[PDB]
Every structure is written in C-alpha cells, then in structure tokens.
Design a protein around this motif. Structure first.
Motif, PDB file in Angstrom:
ATOM      1  N   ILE A  78       0.848  -1.179   0.000  1.00 13.57           N
ATOM      2  CA  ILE A  78       0.000   0.000   0.000  1.00 13.57           C
ATOM      3  C   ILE A  78       0.898   1.248   0.000  1.00 13.57           C
ATOM      4  O   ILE A  78       0.713   2.157  -0.775  1.00 13.57           O
ATOM      5  CB  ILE A  78      -0.863   0.020   1.301  1.00 13.57           C
ATOM      6  CG1 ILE A  78      -1.962  -1.062   1.235  1.00 13.57           C
ATOM      7  CG2 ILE A  78      -1.457   1.403   1.578  1.00 13.57           C
ATOM      8  CD1 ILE A  78      -2.654  -1.373   2.560  1.00 13.57           C
ATOM      9  N   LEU A  84      -2.778   3.653  -3.890  1.00 10.52           N
ATOM     10  CA  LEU A  84      -3.213   3.311  -2.575  1.00 10.52           C
ATOM     11  C   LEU A  84      -2.706   4.202  -1.461  1.00 10.52           C
ATOM     12  O   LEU A  84      -3.362   4.400  -0.453  1.00 10.52           O
ATOM     13  CB  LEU A  84      -2.922   1.837  -2.216  1.00 10.52           C
ATOM     14  CG  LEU A  84      -3.483   0.917  -3.239  1.00 10.52           C
ATOM     15  CD1 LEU A  84      -3.074  -0.489  -2.899  1.00 10.52           C
ATOM     16  CD2 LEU A  84      -4.987   0.946  -3.180  1.00 10.52           C
ATOM     17  N   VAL A  87      -4.811   7.227  -0.342  1.00 11.63           N
ATOM     18  CA  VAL A  87      -6.034   6.790   0.361  1.00 11.63           C
ATOM     19  C   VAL A  87      -5.742   6.420   1.800  1.00 11.63           C
ATOM     20  O   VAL A  87      -6.415   6.830   2.717  1.00 11.63           O
ATOM     21  CB  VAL A  87      -6.747   5.621  -0.315  1.00 11.63           C
ATOM     22  CG1 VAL A  87      -8.114   5.322   0.368  1.00 11.63           C
ATOM     23  CG2 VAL A  87      -6.923   6.027  -1.754  1.00 11.63           C
ATOM     24  N   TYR A  88      -4.765   5.573   1.972  1.00 11.37           N
ATOM     25  CA  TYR A  88      -4.405   5.129   3.291  1.00 11.37           C
ATOM     26  C   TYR A  88      -4.062   6.339   4.187  1.00 11.37           C
ATOM     27  O   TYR A  88      -4.515   6.511   5.332  1.00 11.37           O
ATOM     28  CB  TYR A  88      -3.207   4.161   3.085  1.00 11.37           C
ATOM     29  CG  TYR A  88      -2.770   3.464   4.347  1.00 11.37           C
ATOM     30  CD1 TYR A  88      -1.833   4.029   5.190  1.00 11.37           C
ATOM     31  CD2 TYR A  88      -3.281   2.211   4.657  1.00 11.37           C
ATOM     32  CE1 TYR A  88      -1.485   3.395   6.402  1.00 11.37           C
ATOM     33  CE2 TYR A  88      -2.925   1.566   5.832  1.00 11.37           C
ATOM     34  CZ  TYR A  88      -2.010   2.124   6.689  1.00 11.37           C
ATOM     35  OH  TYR A  88      -1.677   1.441   7.843  1.00 11.37           O
ATOM     36  N   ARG A  95     -10.306   2.341   9.645  1.00 12.63           N
ATOM     37  CA  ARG A  95     -10.500   2.155   8.226  1.00 12.63           C
ATOM     38  C   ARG A  95      -9.257   1.746   7.518  1.00 12.63           C
ATOM     39  O   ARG A  95      -9.280   1.084   6.485  1.00 12.63           O
ATOM     40  CB  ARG A  95     -11.183   3.389   7.558  1.00 12.63           C
ATOM     41  CG  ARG A  95     -12.534   3.690   8.142  1.00 12.63           C
ATOM     42  CD  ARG A  95     -13.166   4.932   7.472  1.00 12.63           C
ATOM     43  NE  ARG A  95     -14.610   5.043   7.680  1.00 12.63           N
ATOM     44  CZ  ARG A  95     -15.121   5.832   8.618  1.00 12.63           C
ATOM     45  NH1 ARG A  95     -14.279   6.510   9.417  1.00 12.63           N
ATOM     46  NH2 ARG A  95     -16.462   5.937   8.840  1.00 12.63           N
ATOM     47  N   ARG A  96      -8.134   2.172   8.050  1.00 18.06           N
ATOM     48  CA  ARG A  96      -6.802   1.747   7.499  1.00 18.06           C
ATOM     49  C   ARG A  96      -6.729   0.180   7.524  1.00 18.06           C
ATOM     50  O   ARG A  96      -6.314  -0.499   6.560  1.00 18.06           O
ATOM     51  CB  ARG A  96      -5.632   2.345   8.305  1.00 18.06           C
ATOM     52  CG  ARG A  96      -5.325   3.765   7.848  1.00 18.06           C
ATOM     53  CD  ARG A  96      -4.183   4.422   8.667  1.00 18.06           C
ATOM     54  NE  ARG A  96      -3.972   5.820   8.219  1.00 18.06           N
ATOM     55  CZ  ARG A  96      -3.125   6.679   8.744  1.00 18.06           C
ATOM     56  NH1 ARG A  96      -2.329   6.403   9.748  1.00 18.06           N
ATOM     57  NH2 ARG A  96      -3.102   7.910   8.240  1.00 18.06           N
ATOM     58  N   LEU A  99      -8.549  -1.365   4.682  1.00 18.66           N
ATOM     59  CA  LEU A  99      -7.891  -1.387   3.382  1.00 18.66           C
ATOM     60  C   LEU A  99      -6.823  -2.465   3.374  1.00 18.66           C
ATOM     61  O   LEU A  99      -6.575  -3.120   2.346  1.00 18.66           O
ATOM     62  CB  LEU A  99      -7.256   0.032   3.084  1.00 18.66           C
ATOM     63  CG  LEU A  99      -6.629   0.282   1.708  1.00 18.66           C
ATOM     64  CD1 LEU A  99      -7.676   0.186   0.611  1.00 18.66           C
ATOM     65  CD2 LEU A  99      -5.980   1.671   1.703  1.00 18.66           C
ATOM     66  N   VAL A 111      -6.940  -4.199  -5.628  1.00 16.71           N
ATOM     67  CA  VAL A 111      -7.522  -3.130  -4.872  1.00 16.71           C
ATOM     68  C   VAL A 111      -7.337  -1.841  -5.611  1.00 16.71           C
ATOM     69  O   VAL A 111      -8.234  -1.007  -5.633  1.00 16.71           O
ATOM     70  CB  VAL A 111      -7.073  -3.093  -3.424  1.00 16.71           C
ATOM     71  CG1 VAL A 111      -7.726  -1.903  -2.692  1.00 16.71           C
ATOM     72  CG2 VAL A 111      -7.395  -4.436  -2.763  1.00 16.71           C
ATOM     73  N   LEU A 118     -12.205   4.040  -4.235  1.00 19.81           N
ATOM     74  CA  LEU A 118     -11.057   4.662  -3.595  1.00 19.81           C
ATOM     75  C   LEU A 118     -11.243   6.192  -3.551  1.00 19.81           C
ATOM     76  O   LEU A 118     -10.929   6.854  -2.574  1.00 19.81           O
ATOM     77  CB  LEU A 118      -9.692   4.288  -4.242  1.00 19.81           C
ATOM     78  CG  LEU A 118      -9.297   2.799  -4.148  1.00 19.81           C
ATOM     79  CD1 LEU A 118      -8.148   2.489  -5.125  1.00 19.81           C
ATOM     80  CD2 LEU A 118      -8.895   2.444  -2.752  1.00 19.81           C
ATOM     81  N   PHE A 153     -15.648   0.136   6.780  1.00 20.79           N
ATOM     82  CA  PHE A 153     -15.425   1.418   6.083  1.00 20.79           C
ATOM     83  C   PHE A 153     -16.553   2.433   6.291  1.00 20.79           C
ATOM     84  O   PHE A 153     -16.331   3.638   6.404  1.00 20.79           O
ATOM     85  CB  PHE A 153     -15.239   1.169   4.556  1.00 20.79           C
ATOM     86  CG  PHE A 153     -13.865   0.734   4.042  1.00 20.79           C
ATOM     87  CD1 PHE A 153     -13.693  -0.406   3.268  1.00 20.79           C
ATOM     88  CD2 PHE A 153     -12.752   1.536   4.254  1.00 20.79           C
ATOM     89  CE1 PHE A 153     -12.461  -0.752   2.737  1.00 20.79           C
ATOM     90  CE2 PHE A 153     -11.488   1.215   3.735  1.00 20.79           C
ATOM     91  CZ  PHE A 153     -11.337   0.027   2.978  1.00 20.79           C
TER      92      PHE A 153
END
Ligand SMILES: [Cl-]
Ligand SMILES: [Cl-]
Length: 162
Positions: A78, A84, A87-88, A95-96, A99, A111, A118, A153
């Motif tokens: 990620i 990615l 987003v992270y 929520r991390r 993912l 993903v 995303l 999420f």
C-alpha cells in the motif's frame, strides 16, 4: 481488535495444505501458496517458504510467522503504490485496517483497480463508497467477509467483528 485479530477471524487457521475459496492451494492464516493446480508445485512452494521439508503440514509458530510477513508485505505494498498510499494516508486507524484487509485478500493490483470506491473513501463519502464497493465480483463471491469489511469502512468502528 487490531489488523491481526481481524484477519485471523476472516481467514481462520489451518495447519495442513487446503484449497481457498477460489480453489487455490493455501496454508496457515490465508497464506496463498500457488495458483497452480499441482499439489506438488504446492508442497515445493511451501518448503521454500518455511525453509524445510515439510510434507504439507506446518506448526502454529510457522503459521504465525508467515502471517507476520504477509501483513508486513500488505502494508508495504500500500505504501509503495501510487494509488493506494494517498487513500491510506487519508484514513483513520480503523479504516486503514479495512484497506489492509482488502489488500491481503486480493493483492495491491486488485484493490488498485477499485478506482471509484477509492476516490469515494478519500472524500469521506462513507455510504456512497459502501454502495460502490458492493458492486464487485469480490462482494458477490465472498459476501459475508465483504460485508464485514464494508461495514468497517462505513462506520469506522469494529462492530462487524464484535
Ligand atoms: Cl513467502
Ligand atoms: Cl464470505
């Protein structure tokens, strides 16, 4: 709850070679060995993974060790991926974990393919992203697990796992 306990609930633990949901040879806590149909190609990959001749079966310790490596790989994947990482970075701690879970199951490539969801997660449009995530082969093929991740999420809590 944390990422490790979450993935342990979703993947379970098996000490002898088994077939995953897609029919691929796996062992331990969701450790994919090969997409190949050969049980032998499976056993060879396993021996190379463990550093020993094993004949198809491993100990709890060996399983957890492959598990630690796989979670570490998941996170690093990620952080290294251009799609990615942002987003992270943008998400809260719970929520991390969600993912990471998706990456662990489907790979960074996969993903990375959920472009719209995303974008929605980055924007913090929880309900809209949950709806989009559900329109996928992923959700259709492993609906109970998919719902759990999705709920994580939407809500940002661990309730689906409690
Ligand atoms: Cl490995
Ligand atoms: Cl499922």
């Amino acid at each position: 709850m944390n990422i490790f306990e979450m993935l342990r609930i979703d993947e379970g633990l098996r000490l002898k070679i088994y077939k995953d949901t897609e029919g691929y040879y796996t062992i331990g806590i969701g450790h994919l060995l090969t997409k190949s149909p050969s049980l032998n190609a499976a056993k060879s990959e396993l021996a190379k993974a463990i550093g020993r001749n094993t004949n198809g079966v491993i100990t709890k310790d060996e399983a957890e060790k492959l598990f630690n490596q796989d979670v570490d790989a998941a996170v690093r994947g990620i952080l290294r991926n251009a799609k990615l990482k942002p987003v992270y970075d943008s998400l809260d701690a719970v929520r991390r974990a969600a993912l990471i879970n998706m990456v662990f199951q489907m790979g960074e490539t996969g993903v990375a393919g959920f472009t719209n969801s995303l974008r929605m997660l980055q924007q913090k449009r929880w309900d809209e992203a949950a709806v989009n995530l559900a329109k996928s082969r992923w959700y259709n093929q492993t609906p109970n697990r998919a719902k759990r991740v999705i709920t994580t999420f939407r809500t940002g809590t661990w309730d689906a796992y409690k």
